[PDB]
Amino acid sequence: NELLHLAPNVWPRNTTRDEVGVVCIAGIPLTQLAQEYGTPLFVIDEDDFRSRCRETAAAFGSGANVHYAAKAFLCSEVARWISEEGLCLDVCTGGELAVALHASFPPERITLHGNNKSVSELTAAVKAGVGHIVVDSMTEIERLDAIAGEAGIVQDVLVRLTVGVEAHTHEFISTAHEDQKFGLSVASGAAMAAVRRVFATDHLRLVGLHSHIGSQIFDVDGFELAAHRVIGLLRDVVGEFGPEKTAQIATVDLGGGLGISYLPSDDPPPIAELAAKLGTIVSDESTAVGLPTPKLVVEPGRAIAGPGTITLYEVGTVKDVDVSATAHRRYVSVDGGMSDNIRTALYGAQYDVRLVSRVSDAPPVPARLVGKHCESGDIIVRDTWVPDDIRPGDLVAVAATGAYCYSLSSRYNMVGRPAVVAVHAGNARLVLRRETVDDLLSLEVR
Amino acid sequence: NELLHLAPNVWPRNTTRDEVGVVCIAGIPLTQLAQEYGTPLFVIDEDDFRSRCRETAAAFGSGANVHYAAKAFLCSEVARWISEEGLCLDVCTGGELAVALHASFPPERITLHGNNKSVSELTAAVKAGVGHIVVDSMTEIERLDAIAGEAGIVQDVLVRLTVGVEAHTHEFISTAHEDQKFGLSVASGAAMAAVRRVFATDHLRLVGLHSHIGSQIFDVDGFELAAHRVIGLLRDVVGEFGPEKTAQIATVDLGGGLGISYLPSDDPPPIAELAAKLGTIVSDESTAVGLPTPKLVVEPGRAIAGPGTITLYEVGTVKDVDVSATAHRRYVSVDGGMSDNIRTALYGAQYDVRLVSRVSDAPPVPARLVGKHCESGDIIVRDTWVPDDIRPGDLVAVAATGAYCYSLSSRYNMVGRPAVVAVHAGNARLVLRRETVDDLLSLEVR
């Protein structure tokens, strides 16, 4: 009828509709997957994930200029996709680096991030030979120096910058004094003080400048300002140390935050266009200050891992709730909740939800997809439409849950993690099995 | 000097200072606790907890009238404490029931909650002989009644109401149409419809009405109006069924949300006083409509498990961030983060945090206790104060993390769940061990 259309910018590349009207991913009907693997279920469309890997890499000239941000979603299978498609991998803590290593990720294609890197983390990284570390404090620079000098290597590093730009969807805020934990201020001199300290020692070596300015960005405008303010530092450093000790700072890392479509109306720019533009503004901005254009590096998380995966639920309860003297809201309770998708409660995110186990001829009715936790705020999709005949047993899917949902998953109310499955050219396979009661108790020490 | 005083209403009841000025819990210096067990670390003052159980029990007449809300924090060890203290236990999903059972908590004393109970969950609960189930939809009534009949029993049952009172700290909102997922509206007739269904079944027995109206409540005003609306439903229920079928509805459960002190300035009423007003609100309101007073039940989660415990961290980085042309904010980055305490990001919570490894002279400086994840919003304490000589390797501790902290814990950025440890009179045992790279990978297949 009208809730039937599956906006292609929102749903995985390989979504189709059955002859019996069952939504399918990679040739497999979602009903099949719920019978085989249970619900709730995370369903990853592997070709989608790889596709986006490939489209981004082409857009920026090389998969090497594209670092996947592990925090969006990480496991061995994914580390292995990243590796195969030739991108780099951005890990953020000791734990992330471990997993990437356990999955035999090339450690020269790993960059390590973080505002509070411990000593053991910095050690373990040069020990495996990570080969970029984006430093975030004077203290980390001191530690990294000792540690690296001790190992008899020269660690390539980037310094993380605050340029006071914060971008989201179609706007951005600029501030005199960015008030957050990451990076070093350009304007207050802290960043230049750091650039010096890194020049003072022989055990580190500054190879670029990093800036991360937001998420869910749909415009290039904020990157342009951010890039201007970053290249501005570059100017300052060749102005104090002359183009020679500086020739080797040839990378500008503009971070991630490249947005995706959670809702049909969401209109992030095709990656190719976006990339062409950024490349232009990096080249205009560096030339208009007397400097050879540096290479552009970005760090996508979501824009790779997000659209390809969907979360499949089973309707359990359907309750009509009166919200005014005339109007109602259809609360449809589902298999999971803030345990596998906290994004709605935590960031006020908005998702798209659809009936997938069949096609309904019933009219659209206003609705709330909620979960099963004992908390009124356990809402998965705050505002949507649902066919009037939605009923227990039906299966629904929430789109674009591949980034940030599982990584943030918890065991609230002792609800185990859902299973994760990948589907590819007709074939599904369990990647991350579903937690069980034994898992829930595994930490308990008798 | 003033960052030195540990308010007694905020920190666990057995908190003290060393002769060398180190903070201790039930007699163990925190710094000692840190070297054996590591940080991040949950330290539970076991005796504060039991102490909290006994007091509440005493106020509302008996442990039978106080059900502890598992969702706040649950493991076998805690299940055992609640049991030993003679209270009941509210569980919310299958997993919560399972753990309680494994800890062989007495099922007569368990009560099952939830907005979307599954057929299997309700089946398991009748099998275990659960004893009370608070029903939330007409669908649950059909499902439950069948399940009880097949098992040959009559399941006692309360109905969850929506009375249009939402309460927080020193105020409450009233609404004509409460717009949330739980319960059955009284004003709409949804509640009567439910009461009527339960009376009409063969296999259910209605023994009370249930109402939960908020969180962090400090006034009794919201409870008053609630009980009023709630007991007004009882008044209808004898205007239909007359008194003889209604003298089985003998329990009014007013939910939880009883408040606690996160900051020194927080003034929740002392439990013995609260109970006594609520007891009299129920008797005044109960005869006001010609009924004999039902017994009052209450459902604290936070008020039991909250204050007893704290979270111990190790400062790793200290950055001084310019937030104004003249002002500064001391970013003190720490050992875990939103993974072990998401409340600040999720609800905008406000916590106390103090230096505990030692005493300082240095004057207090404005600060933000921040975590180690690759996200700017990874903030544990947004607005506090730290001694100016604060430096890495120091130990700080955050008060009142006993409730909804570890329950909400995730593995964001593969940061494993901290260890949880109980301390009773100079002795400290491990309760929940800390996760490791193996637990991180424990759901991987191949």
Ligand SMILES: *Cc1c(COP(=O)(O)O)cnc(C)c1O
């Ligand atoms: C989170 C993060 C990213 C990725 O963010 P997305 O919005 O998911 O694209 C990239 N770089 C850094 C430093 C980050 O913290």
Ligand SMILES: *Cc1c(COP(=O)(O)O)cnc(C)c1O
């Ligand atoms: C959360 C909850 C409680 C207790 O809440 P606290 O604020 O932690 O006291 C009681 N009953 C129900 C049904 C709940 O969901």
Ligand SMILES: N[C@@H](CCCC[NH3+])C(=O)O
């Ligand atoms: N908001 C509380 C739980 C309230 C439950 C509302 N039905 C928490 O901190 O988790």
Ligand SMILES: N[C@@H](CCCC[NH3+])C(=O)O
């Ligand atoms: N506020 C962001 C979350 C950022 C995730 C990591 N920096 C969003 O739109 O979801």
